[PDB]
Design a protein around this ligand. Structure first.
Ligand code: HEC
Ligand code: HEC
Ligand code: HEC
Ligand code: HEC
Ligand SMILES: [Ca+2]
Ligand SMILES: [Ca+2]
Ligand SMILES: [Ca+2]
Ligand SMILES: [Ca+2]
Ligand SMILES: [Ca+2]
Ligand SMILES: [Ca+2]
Ligand SMILES: [Cl-]
Ligand SMILES: [Mg+2]
Ligand SMILES: [Xe]
Ligand SMILES: [Xe]
Ligand SMILES: [Zn+2]
Lengths: 768, 314, 352
């Protein structure tokens, strides 16, 4: 049936219509695959979602007709997350074998034979899906490339099985909630790199598993967990992303439904991450799309880390509040793992009181319909019906994976590091208007501290996030800053919700507000627009990432160009600063290490660093990871405070900056010094997420301290009711040089941390 | 009630387009250097693939959004990513495309690839568009071949501006020998005769006419300089968003493949980047270097207008 | 017959256009590749004949009495006068380059023909009694695609689709005077395929596309390259020009072409050629949005990709390439002409 578009005949659909062809190619459903889990906190750890390893679980095949069940996973200690292939005669899943090896990705024929291990990794693997790239039709494709100034010729052939997109986490890492997992999406070559070689002309770059004849590449660099990938009608990857960055979303963070390319080239929000939207802090997981009415249907859990909850829906074509629905939808129980069929039916895992089972869903009664199968001794979830899946269109990839780009001219793969000689993978990005935003003027860091027009934004600060890794358990403590702004998300490293970060670098902005820059690739980052004093007016709280050689465009600053609105037509100066040279990949300037000012401390220009090292016409700077600069309170700030501040600031004259780097015990926890505890102290009647008395994390321009150091009204947001005292006033603007003052500014804009050097170091800190 | 389809009236014979089959890889697209033997049975399928927006990602647009459905052009000027950013390209007039290879605009100079510039086949033009323009799934061999068949089957419309008698006018003939004047020298790069049906009015070569857009510091510099003199003293905003045509640009090459003068009346916004807004601007030495395109400097307004009228007759 | 712009032969009619008699008993289909016009009885829905005209007709118009059919032959650079009862072409009048459309005056005394040639700006007037071209009305710019006559009959609009232009306008003509009173520019527009009037004559609708030309070509998302739009212009002096989106975020209507206005002006029908479907909109919600919004707010709302769902009635599956649509006088049925499928889709509307 025609869905998105009309077909060749009345009542039939064009091959370009994914939903319609899915309707026509489905066929009758007889057998279904689903996961049976032991009923225990350890047997069904849905409270630890996205990190889910239902130890003792099995995957089973059930016949809707003969009603006889068979366990295919008996050789596995744990198995879950089944996903069927296109033909439906084989399926991929996640689990750990009895022989060991950890939780990995496997695939097996649905008759129970032909088992294969797709992943050997240090970490945990989850929720594999098949993405067919270069494979629409069953058979062998040919591999062709250019001869290194020769012609294009054929070398060999490859069986086309397509690729596998899955979500996985490394070993011994912490997310922004200090949970011991960080999940991200990976693409997997089933043929051992030669599928990518068929598409690109070079094998997949990434981690190779030669024993399994597979190769993996990380397509999503978010510091928090990205989980539960699925397929969009237009051939992209639909999944759930955790945006925890800093103090955003009331210091909580949100789980958003979003899409990205299978190489991770173009991540964009679908629903749930933006203010004014529905669901608040509710967890959003296991999202899938209906074929008939085209509606994204997801599990909305009352708790962010929960995998069970209600069922809600939003239109795929128009993901906005107007199309939001709560599917179930009242009494009395819990729902999980919905699976919309092309015939418009749906399979849900429902628990009336306490125990889940497979049930047909009833859209008229807005609840679970007739029962399929329930064992009382098992929790029955993740229904995966057996039918024919229509392959969504595969999008061209300009990256061969790690360090590897593919030129837009000759379309040949190249290694930016091993060959071209660059210290690290480097992409570019461009914003046509940095002053253009949908956000109002407000105290919160993601909003504007003041009104800014073209010319008011001089430059931009680019910040790289650092993963939280603490091998030594004695030198790290979570909740050390509980009395400070950070609250529960604080730690030994920071008294705020902001984890460890560093400065990628500064880039100038054109008079029309446009800016373009070259920077590191395959690393989490975000940016801040700066005024003529070099302070952040507005902060982008999220983790951006660039694949090698990839550019990324945006119309404005959270303008809606990547969310709810069409690109604004803009003729920008930065466009001509991007690539003008025949001999270059990108002619755009790399991020500068410093900023230089005038006498009074106003913005003068950008200043090169010592990190400067023929495929680009500009000096290559900031690609060396070891040389990346950050601002550490102990190494940088505290000495300045000791020299020029702690003199006349003592217990009698608040804030108390004295005591040096000596730790102070608060609630039985020794983490920071006196000055840090004093400056990070909260204020009555002020949202800690906005800031404290003297410090607003990720806003220097809103901070009382900076207000006093410049002795002026910096923003439209007053830190308190009485700022400058009437009598006994002393001007602080002459106490520091521009370097020290702007060092404090940088420290605050970075999130005002304590330990910015990842892992245990020689500098003072928590010890037990 | 709710709108629905009750019935379909079939006036003519039933026709269905080509299937999806197996999409080509980009190397497979580059693997086709030269045209396949022409097939006139595939032309309609190619027309469909040309006008279809459903094959694209979300259905935003089709080939017909640029090259029209007449198989001519919309005159829209775009910035493509393979030739560099800030380098603008006037949308190509696709009538009578097969008669003058190589394709696109940029010629052999600076293009050893023969893909972006000096394109060897029409296959390398349209075949790449799914991944380099539409950002959608690549074409199958059959659909691509059919598309190219449709493109090659496009013929010139002919100029409306000549007498119903078939002859030329006195103004057009007045301009004809200004055109063919050995010192003006249009015939050099544009050889042809008005009433000769097979005249392509192009040498199919790569020349420097001084239309190369450079930076303020010269070639391979940034930012661009205004190449439009009349617009420059007019006080037009270089980065202005309301202009039909860019008055600035940065080109990766100084030389270009010469287009046909046939149906030049129907190309809006001439040259490569769309620098020339009218035919007159391809002459008066405004948007190009002095006497680098023909020698027109000695000519005065009446002769120039006659020359324009003769151009309209092609 | 020949495929347009080619010397290659085809046996398929390839309908480019459709219209209906004022009594609603007959459908007249212009066959581009068939070089003829198909007659269809609306009641029995089957073909009652095929009338040979000059080569590649792209358009047709029926006299108020319905005794004649004026067909636009594009490549012949002419207009064929056909007897409807006799099923025979009784004359050929010749006009400026590429007529893409023709419309008969309310009194039926005059026919206006839009000459769409790229370098050609003309509207040729034709007396029905003389059955011949009288004079030519020169527009403000090149390539008028289509015209439309007011219910008043005293005003004539022409959509100017101008190659190599980002700003494309609409000309207002005073029929009694016979020249341009005003020219209203649609900004950032291209490919205007149609113009229609509201029954009260207070508004006009124009289907087109909004390119972003000044931006890099990078992705297909959020209409970075092309968005598809319908524009409502208030015929009032100094009236608003409202550019409205036809698109969802992930769903776009490729190349909107034909338009049919509900007799009471309740609904708007838009042929979508690229996506092969008929988009039906609620005109009271659209005009309601126009009246209650300022120019600034509308200009901002043009890029709203969730806005359509407010005024969007339906999107109906059609054959391939529905380049034109028309309505029955009762407005209860909408016919869509499909070029590639060589057929006509019949739609039951919301009107009951
Ligand atoms: C080193 C550069 C510093 C920093 C970072 C601060 N001080 Fe001072 N301070 C002094 C006096 C007499 C006052 C009260 C009178 C007045 O505020 O004008 C202050 C006040 C402050 C504040 C404001 C605290 C509040 O309003 O709650 C802050 C944030 C602050 N200081 C920080 C005196 C001196 C002084 C000479 C005795 C020196 C040297 C410094 N201060 C240095 C610093
Ligand atoms: C060789 C040096 C040439 C001479 C002598 C003439 N022309 Fe030309 N023509 C030439 C080139 C290399 C180009 C394209 C340049 C670019 O930047 O794209 C052209 C183009 C034209 C055009 C426009 C064609 C189009 O836009 O598709 C016209 C109308 C034209 N030329 C006419 C013309 C006249 C009138 C000449 C005598 C004064 C003449 N040409 C000479 C190459 C050369
Ligand atoms: C001004 C600072 C900018 C600029 C120049 C860009 N972005 Fe966007 N960004 C910005 C804000 C205020 C937010 C929301 C912060 C919050 O706490 O809610 C974001 C967020 C994103 C996201 C997450 C999804 C969403 O919120 O819509 C993505 C994805 C994203 N930003 C991408 C992005 C791109 C591609 C840009 C072009 C260079 C870009 N940002 C620029 C503020 C700003
Ligand atoms: C098939 C198909 C074609 N088009 Fe394309 N087109 C566009 C531009 C800006 C240019 C010029 C680029 C340059 O000069 O570097 C072209 C060029 C062509 C040509 C060459 C004709 C010739 O005589 O050399 C052909 C045959 C062609 N194109 C075919 C602009 C666009 C578009 C706007 C973004 C789009 C949508 C488009 N072209 C689409 C297509 C085709 C559909 C796959
Ligand atoms: Ca159960
Ligand atoms: Ca540390
Ligand atoms: Ca370009
Ligand atoms: Ca050529
Ligand atoms: Ca042109
Ligand atoms: Ca003509
Ligand atoms: Cl934006
Ligand atoms: Mg993309
Ligand atoms: Xe960002
Ligand atoms: Xe549809
Ligand atoms: Zn947002």
């Amino acid at each position: 049936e025609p869905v998105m578009t009309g077909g060749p005949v009345q009542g039939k659909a064009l091959w370009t219509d994914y939903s319609g062809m899915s309707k026509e190619v489905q066929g009758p459903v007889s057998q279904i695959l689903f996961t049976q889990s032991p009923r225990t906190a350890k047997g069904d750890p849905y409270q630890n979602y996205p990190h889910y390893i239902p130890e003792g679980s099995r995957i089973v095949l059930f016949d809707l007709n003969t009603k006889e069940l068979k366990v295919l996973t008996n050789d596995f200690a744990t198995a879950f997350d089944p996903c069927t292939y296109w033909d439906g005669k084989k399926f991929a899943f996640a689990g750990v074998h009895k022989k060991g090896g950890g939780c990995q990705i496997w695939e097996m024929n649905i008759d129970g034979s032909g088992l294969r291990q797709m992943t050997d990794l240090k970490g945990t693997c989850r929720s594999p899906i098949y993405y067919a790239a270069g494979s629409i039709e069953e058979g062998e494709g040919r591999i062709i490339w250019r001869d290194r100034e020769g012609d294009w010729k054929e070398h060999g052939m490859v069986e086309k099985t397509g690729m596998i997109i899955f979500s996985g986490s490394p070993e011994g890492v912490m997310d922004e909630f200090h949970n011991p997992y960080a999940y991200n999406l990976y693409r997997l070559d089933t043929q051992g790199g030669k599928i990518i070689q068929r598409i690109t002309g070079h094998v997949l770059s990434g981690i190779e598993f030669p024993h399994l004849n597979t190769t993996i590449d990380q397509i999503t660099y978010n510091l928090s967990s990205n989980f539960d990938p699925w397929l969009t009608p237009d051939g992209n990857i639909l999944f759930s992303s955790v945006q925890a960055n800093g103090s955003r979303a009331g210091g909580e963070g949100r789980v958003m439904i979003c899409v990205d390319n299978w190489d991770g080239a173009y991540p964009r929000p679908i629903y749930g991450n933006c203010d004014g939207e529905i669901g608040g802090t509710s967890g959003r997981s296991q999202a899938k799309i209906t074929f008939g009415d085209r509606k994204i249907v997801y599990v909305e859990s009352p708790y962010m880390n929960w995998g069970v909850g209600q069922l809600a829906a939003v239109s795929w074509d128009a993901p906005f509040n107007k199309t939001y629905e709560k599917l179930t939808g009242k009494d009395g129980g819990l729902y999980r793992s919905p699976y919309p069929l092309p015939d418009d039916r749906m399979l849900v895992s429902y628990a009336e009181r306490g125990d889940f089972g497979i049930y047909w869903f009833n859209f008229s009664k807005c609840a679970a319909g007739d029962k399929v199968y329930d064992d009382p001794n098992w929790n029955d979830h993740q229904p995966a019906p057996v039918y024919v899946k229509y392959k969504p269109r595969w999008i061209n990839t300009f990256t061969a994976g790690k360090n590897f780009g593919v030129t837009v001219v000759t379309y040949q793969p190249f290694d930016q590091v091993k060959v071209e000689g660059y210290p690290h993978s480097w992409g570019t990005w461009i914003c046509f208007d940095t002053t253009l935003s949908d956000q109002p003027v407000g105290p919160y860091p993601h909003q504007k501290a003041k009104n800014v027009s073209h010319g008011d934004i001089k430059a931009v600060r680019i910040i790289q996030g650092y993963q939280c890794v603490e091998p030594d358990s004695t030198r790290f403590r979570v909740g050390a800053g509980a009395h400070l702004l950070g609250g529960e998300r604080s730690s030994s490293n920071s008294g705020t919700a902001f984890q460890q970060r560093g400065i990628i670098g500064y880039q100038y902005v054109e008079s029309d507000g446009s800016t373009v820059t070259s920077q590191l690739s395959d690393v989490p980052y975000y940016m801040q627009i700066l005024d003529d004093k070099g302070m952040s007016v507005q902060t982008a709280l999220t983790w951006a990432y660039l694949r090698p050689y990839h550019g990324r465009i945006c119309s404005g600053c959270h303008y809606g160009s990547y969310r709810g609105r069409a690109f604004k037509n803009i003729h920008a100066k930065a466009l001509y600063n991007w690539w003008y040279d025949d001999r270059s990949h990108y002619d755009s300037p790399f991020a500068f290490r410093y900023l230089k000012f005038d006498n009074d401390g106003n913005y003068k220009g950008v200043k090169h660093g010592e990190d400067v090292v023929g495929t680009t016409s500009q000096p290559v700077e900031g690609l060396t990871l070891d040389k990346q600069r950050t601002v550490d309170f102990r190494r940088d700030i505290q000495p300045i405070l000791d020299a020029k501040c702690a003199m006349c600031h003592d217990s009698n004259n608040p804030p108390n900056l004295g005591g040096g780097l000596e730790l102070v015990s608060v609630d039985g926890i020794a983490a920071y010094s006196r000055a840090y505890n004093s400056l990070l102290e909260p204020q009555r009647g002020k949202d800690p997420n906005i800031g404290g008395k003297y410090v607003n994390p990720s806003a220097a321009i809103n901070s009382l301290l900076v207000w006093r150091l410049y002795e002026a009204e910096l923003s439209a947001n007053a830190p308190r009711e009485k700022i400058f005292p009437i009598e006994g006033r002393l001007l602080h603007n002459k106490f520091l040089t521009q370097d020290e003052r702007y060092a404090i500014v940088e420290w605050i804009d970075l999130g005002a941390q304590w330990d910015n050097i990842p892992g245990p170091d020689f500098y003072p800190g928590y010890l037990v | 009630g709710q709108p629905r389809v009750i019935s379909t009236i079939q006036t003519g014979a039933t026709w269905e387009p080509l299937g999806r089959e197996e999409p080509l890889t980009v190397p497979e697209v580059h693997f086709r250097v030269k045209h396949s033997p022409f097939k006139s049975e595939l032309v309609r399928y190619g027309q469909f693939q040309f006008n279809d927006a459903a094959w694209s990602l979300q259905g935003s647009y089709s080939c017909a959004s640029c090259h029209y459905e007449r198989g001519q052009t919309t005159g829209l000027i775009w910035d493509l990513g393979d030739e560099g950013w800030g380098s603008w390209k006037n949308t190509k007039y696709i009538r009578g495309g097969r008669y003058l290879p190589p394709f696109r605009h940029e010629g052999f100079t600076g293009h050893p690839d023969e893909i972006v510039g000096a394109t060897s086949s029409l296959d390398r033009v349209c075949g790449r568009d799914p991944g380099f323009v539409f950002r959608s799934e690549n074409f199958s061999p059959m659909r691509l071949e059919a598309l190219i068949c449709y493109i090659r089957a496009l013929e010139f419309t002919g100029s409306p501006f000549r007498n119903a008698d078939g002859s030329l006018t006195e103004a057009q003939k007045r301009g004809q020998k200004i055109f063919e004047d050995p010192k003006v020298g249009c015939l050099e790069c544009h050889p042809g005769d008005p009433m000769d049906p097979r005249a392509l009015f192009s040498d199919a070569q790569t020349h420097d006419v001084g239309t190369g857009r450079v930076g303020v510091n010269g070639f391979r510099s940034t930012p661009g300089k205004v190449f439009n003199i009349s617009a420059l003293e007019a006080g037009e905003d270089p980065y202005g968003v309301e202009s039909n045509t860019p008055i600035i640009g940065l080109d990766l090459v100084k030389e270009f493949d010469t287009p046909t003068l046939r149906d030049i009346y129907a190309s809006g916004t001439y040259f490569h980047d769309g620098g020339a807004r009218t035919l007159m601007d391809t002459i008066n030495n405004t948007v190009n270097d002095k006497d680098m395109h023909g020698r027109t400097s000695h000519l005065k307004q009446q002769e120039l207008q006659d020359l324009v009228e003769y151009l309209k007759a092609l | 017959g020949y495929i347009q712009g080619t010397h290659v032969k085809t046996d398929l009619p390839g309908p480019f256009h459709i219209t209906m008699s004022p009594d609603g008993s007959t459908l007249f289909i212009s066959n581009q590749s068939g070089h003829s016009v198909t007659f269809v009885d609306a009641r029995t829905q089957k073909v009652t004949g095929e009338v040979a005209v000059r080569v590649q007709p792209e358009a047709s118009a029926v006299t108020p009495d319905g005794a004649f059919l004026y067909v636009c032959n594009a490549e012949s650079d002419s207009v064929s006068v056909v007897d409807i009862q006799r099923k025979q072409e009784i004359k050929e009048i010749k006009v400026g380059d590429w007529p893409s459309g023709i419309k008969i005056s309310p009194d039926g005394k005059t026919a206006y023909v839009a000459c769409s040639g790229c370098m050609w700006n003309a509207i040729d007037v034709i007396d029905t009694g003389r059955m011949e071209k009288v004079r030519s009305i020169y527009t403000s710019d090149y390539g008028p695609r289509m015209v439309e006559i007011s219910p008043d009959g005293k005003t004539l609009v022409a959509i100017l689709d101008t190659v190599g232009s980002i700003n494309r306008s609409v000309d207002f003509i005073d029929i009694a005077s016979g020249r341009v009173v005003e020219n209203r520019v649609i900004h950032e527009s291209s490919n205007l395929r149609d113009v229609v009037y509201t029954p009260d004559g207070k508004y006009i609708a124009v289907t087109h596309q909004t390119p972003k030309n000044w931006l890099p070509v990078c992705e297909a998302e959020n209409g970075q390259v092309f968005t598809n739009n319908v524009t409502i212009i208030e015929t009032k002096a100094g009236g608003k020009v409202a550019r409205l989106p036809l698109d969802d975020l992930n769903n776009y209507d490729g190349n909107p072409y034909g338009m049919a206005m509900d007799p009471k002006g309740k609904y708007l029908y838009i042929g979508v050629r690229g996506m092969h479907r008929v988009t039906i909109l609620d005109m009271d919600k659209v005009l309601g949005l126009v009246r209650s919004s300022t120019q600034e707010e509308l200009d901002y709302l043009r890029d709203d990709l969730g806005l359509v769902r407010d005024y969007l009635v339906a999107r109906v599956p059609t054959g391939l390439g529905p380049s034109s649509v028309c309505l029955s006088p009762d407005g209860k049925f909408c016919y869509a002409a499909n070029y590639f499928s060589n057929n006509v889709t019949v739609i039951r509307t919301a009107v009951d």
